[PDB]
Write a structure and sequence with these properties.
The structure is cut from a larger assembly and holds 3 copies of chain A, 2 copies of chain B (48 residues), 2 copies of chain D (317 residues) and 1 copy of chain G (50 residues).
Chain A: H1 11-29
Chain D: E1 2-7, H1 14-22, E2 27-34, H2 39-45, E3 53-58, H3 63-66, E4 72-75, H4 87-108, E5 113-116, H5 125-133, E6 143-145, H6 148-161, E7 173-175, E8 182-184, H7 197-217, H8 227-243, E9 250-256, E10 264-272, E11 275-279, H9 289-312
Parallel strand pairs in D: 1-2, 1-4, 2-3, 4-5, 5-6
Antiparallel strand pairs in D: 7-8, 9-10, 10-11
Helix pairs in contact in D: 1-8, 4-5, 5-9, 6-7
Chain G: H1 11-29
Classes of the chains: A mainly alpha (36), B alpha+beta (48), D alpha/beta (317), G mainly alpha (50).
Subcellular location (chain F): Plastid, Chloroplast stroma
Family (chain F): Belongs to the Ycf2 family.
Function (chain F): Probable ATPase of unknown function. Its presence in a non-photosynthetic plant (Epifagus virginiana) and experiments in tobacco indicate that it has an essential function which is probably not related to photosynthesis.
Amino acid sequence: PDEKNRITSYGFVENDSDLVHGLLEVQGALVGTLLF
Amino acid sequence: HEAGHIVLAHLFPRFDWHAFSQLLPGGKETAVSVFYPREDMVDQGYTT
Amino acid sequence: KMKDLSPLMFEDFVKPFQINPDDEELLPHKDRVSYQPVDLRAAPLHRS
Amino acid sequence: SYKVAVLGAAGGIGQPLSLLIKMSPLVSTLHLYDIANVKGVAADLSHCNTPSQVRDFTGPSELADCLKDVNVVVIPAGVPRKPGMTRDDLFNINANIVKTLVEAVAENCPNAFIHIISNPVNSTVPIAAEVLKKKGVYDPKKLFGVTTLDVVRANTFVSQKKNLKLIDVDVPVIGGHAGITILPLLSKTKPSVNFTDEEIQELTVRIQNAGTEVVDAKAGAGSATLSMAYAAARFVESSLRALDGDGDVYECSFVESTLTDLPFFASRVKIGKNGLEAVIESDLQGLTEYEQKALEALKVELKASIDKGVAFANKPA
Amino acid sequence: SYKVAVLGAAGGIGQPLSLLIKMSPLVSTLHLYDIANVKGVAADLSHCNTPSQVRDFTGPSELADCLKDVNVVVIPAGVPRKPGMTRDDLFNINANIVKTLVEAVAENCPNAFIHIISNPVNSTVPIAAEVLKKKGVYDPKKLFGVTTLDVVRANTFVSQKKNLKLIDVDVPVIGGHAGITILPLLSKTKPSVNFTDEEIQELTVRIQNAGTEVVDAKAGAGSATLSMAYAAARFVESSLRALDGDGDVYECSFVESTLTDLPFFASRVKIGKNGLEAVIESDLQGLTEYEQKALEALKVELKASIDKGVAFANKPA
Amino acid sequence: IDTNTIRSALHRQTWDLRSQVRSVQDHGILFYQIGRAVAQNVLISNCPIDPIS
Amino acid sequence: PMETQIISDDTWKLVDEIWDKKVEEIKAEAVIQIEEEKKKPQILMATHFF
Amino acid sequence: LSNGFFRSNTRSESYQYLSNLFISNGTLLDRMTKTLLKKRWLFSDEMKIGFM
C-alpha cells in the first residue's frame, strides 16, 4: 500500500521508541572489541 | 466551498456520516458542515 | 441525489488488513523491513 | 595541497584517470604529460570548476620540468593490446617506456610516490626497482604496484554472488596481477559469510580470468580503460591520504616485501607519510588447503615473471 | 533508485559520461545503448564495485527493450567533427540520429526526462520537440537542452580572473549553446565583485570562444570529451535530484520558455518532480546596456537556429 | 497450590474488569506483541512476560 | 553515504549463541518436562543409626 | 547535533539482524499468531510449548 495500513500514534510504540532513544543516549554518553 | 467539502465527503465509500450543512449560520459570513465519525473508528482508539 | 448519478468511486482507504482465524497457512512477507537509515551528507569540499 | 604527476595521461587509461584525479579534494596541481595529444586533454580539463590546477608538458624536453616538487608519480603509460602482436614485444615496449619514465623520475624527483601501472606489472615493478637501484636513489618504501583492480573485481563478484551490500564487502587478494597469480582470500572476507567449494572455485576462476573476459568482450578494441582508471584513482587517493598523515591507510599493493621467498609480492600493506610503513602479516597464514596449493602453484609462475623482469631490466645498452 | 538510459554511450562523450553516471549515489540501473561497441563498455563498467547495475542493448531492434521503466533519457549521440566535413552534412547526420532516437523514446517511454547533448543543441532541441509533437506525447516540461558547459566555463574564467575561490563562483548564462548566443551575466555574479569594462569584454569573448579554442587546441582530434561529459553528468545528477523531491533544484538549461518572443531559450530554470516547475524571470531584468545589446544581437541568431531546426524536423519522408 | 492457581491469582491483581468489551479489529498489532514477546523470551532470560491478548 | 560497518560480526555471533542456547533449552524442556515415578519419604534414613 | 546519524544506522543494523532472525523462524510466529487468534488469552507456558 502507499503506507495505507499503519497504526500511527498508539500505545506501546511510543514507549518502545523512547526506550530505544534512552538506551542509545546512555550508551553514547558513557563511551568515554564490542563496538567497531 | 461547502459543496466541494460535501462532494469530497460523499465520493468516498467509508467517510463519516454527513449530518447536515448550513450556509450563513446565524448571520455569520461563513458556512459549516457536520460530520460524525463512525463508531468503529472511536472503538479502535487509534488512527490509520 | 448522487444515487442515480453514478460518480467515480474512490477506493477504500481504511479497509483493515486481517488474518484468517484458523486457516492453517504460511502467510508471506516481502522479505524485509521497510525502514531506510537516515544518512544524507554531502562529500567534503575541495582544497583540503 | 599535494602535487600529482601522471606520466602518460593522453592514452587510453590516462584521460579518465586524469579526469578522476582532477576532481578529488586532495589534488591542487597536476602535470599531464605524454609524447603527443596532451595539449587537448589539459585544455579540456582546464574548464572544469574544480580548484585543482592543470599544467601539461609535451616531449622529453619538458619532462625535466614536469617532475618538480612532485609528491606522487603516476605511470599509466603503455600501449594497449594490438592485433597480430605477442607478449614479448608488448613486454619490451612497455618496459622501455617505464624505464624512461622511472629514469626521468630518478633524475628529477627521488622522493615522490611511484605508481607503476604498465602491463605486465608483475615483471614491471622489478624493472622500476632495478633502474632506481642503478642510480642509488632506490627507496623500496616509495614504489608500489597498482593491484586494486583484483580487489575491486573480487568485491563485485562476491557481493553479486552472496548478495551482500557492496560497500561493506572487501576481499583480500594476494600474489600478483597476471592470471593465475591472483589468489583471492575468500576465507578472510568481511562481513563473515560461509562459502561452499564450488562457489569458491568459480569465484576464483572468474577473478583470475575477468581481465581475459573483458579483453575478449571488447572484440580486440583494447583493454579495460574505465575500471583501470577507477582502481588507479582509488590507489592515488589512498596514497594522497597517506601523505596527509592518516593513520589507517590500508591497501593491497604489489611491493618488495619479504613474506615469501619472492622479492616482490602483492598483499595488504599499511602506508604512511614516508611510504610503506607496515605489511599486514595476518594474510599469509590461516589459509585452507585450497589457498595453500593455489599459492604454491602461483609461486613458481610469479618467480618466473619476476626473473624475466629483472633479467630484461639488466640487459646491456 | 532510478534508471538512466544513455543513447550513444560508446562515442567520445559517452564513455566518460557513462563512467561518471555510474559513480552517482542515486543511479540503480544503467541502460547503455549504441549501434556498435557497447558490449565492451558494459564489460568495462560491470566490474566496478558500485551497486548501480549495468545492462547494454545493441542495435535498434533491442532499442525497444532499452527504454522500459527508464526515468532519465540521456542523448549524447552524434558523430564528432571530421576533416572535409561541412556544417550541413554534420547537422543532417546528428539530426537524423537524434530524430530516430526521439521517435524511439516517444514510442517506448514518453514520460522520461530527455536531455539533448548533440551539437548544436540550439537547433536540435526544436527537432526533438517537433518529433515529440508528431506523436502527441510532447511534454514541454520534460525536455531539456544541456548548456551547463557555458556556465562551468564562465565560473572557471571568472574565478581565474578575479581570484575568487572557485567553489562559490557562479555566473548566469543566457541565450543558447552555440557561439555568440551564449551571454554570461557578469553583472549578476556571486560573490559580489566589481568588474571593469575591458575585463567584461575579454571575459565575454573568452566564454563565447572557449569551445572553438578547445577544438583548435586538439588540432582536429575531435571536440571536448571530458568537460562536456562533466557538464552532462552535472545536469543528469541535478535532474535525478529533481526526481528525488528536493525543492531547490535550480539549473541553467535551453528549454521552451516564453520569457521572450523566442519559443526556446537558455535560462535559469527550477526543476521539480514532474519536470520543469519554474523559470527564473528575473534574469532578463536588471541588465546593463552591454547585456541589452548583446541580447538584441543574439536574438536573431538564436531565432535563425531554431527556425532551421524546426524546418528540418518537419521535412517530408 | 498448582500452577493454574498462581496464574489465576496473578491475573486477578494486575488486570482491570471492564464492560463494553471490544477486541482488536486490525490484526497487525498482534504481530508486534508476538515478536516482542518472543524476543523478550529468548533474549532477556531474566525478565517477565506479561500475557498477550 | 558516509556510513561504514557497525558494531560487529562477533557480537552477532554472541547473540546468536544466546538465541540458540535458549532455543535448545526450550525445545528440551518441552519434551522431557514431566517424568515423575514416585516420592517415598525416607523416614528410615539408616545412615544416621545403622 | 553531529550525533544523529549514528543512532539511526545502529537501529538499522538491529532491524536487519531482527529481520534475518525472524525470516528463518517465521513458522514459529505464524503458528503462534494462529494460536493467539484461536484462543484469546495466552501465557508463557504456551510460548515454551509452541516454540516447536
